[PDB]
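Obj.: predict assembly geometry.
Materials: sequence records (below).
Method: joint structure prediction, all chains together.
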Amino acid sequence: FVQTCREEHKKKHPDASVNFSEFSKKCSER
DNA sequence: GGTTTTTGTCTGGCTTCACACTTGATTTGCATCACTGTGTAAGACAGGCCAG
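Observations (raw structure tokens):
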């Protein structure tokens, strides 16, 4: 799932390179 | 069902090779040479059963 989540968020966060720990937490929380 | 494991996910900044291009003198790869001895089998041949 995590790849798809991050791919969707590529536009959600306009140009940010997101953290590993926090992105894990977010994909986890959904 | 809980309790245990495998195997993924997301980045980048890292380390470690391969490739890039040239020249010409080495080094390798590979097929070939000339050549007889040896096995195999295509011949020839004397031989002996038997009939006129």
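Conclusions so far: Chain A is about 70% helix and 0% strand.
To do: check interface contacts against the pulldown list.
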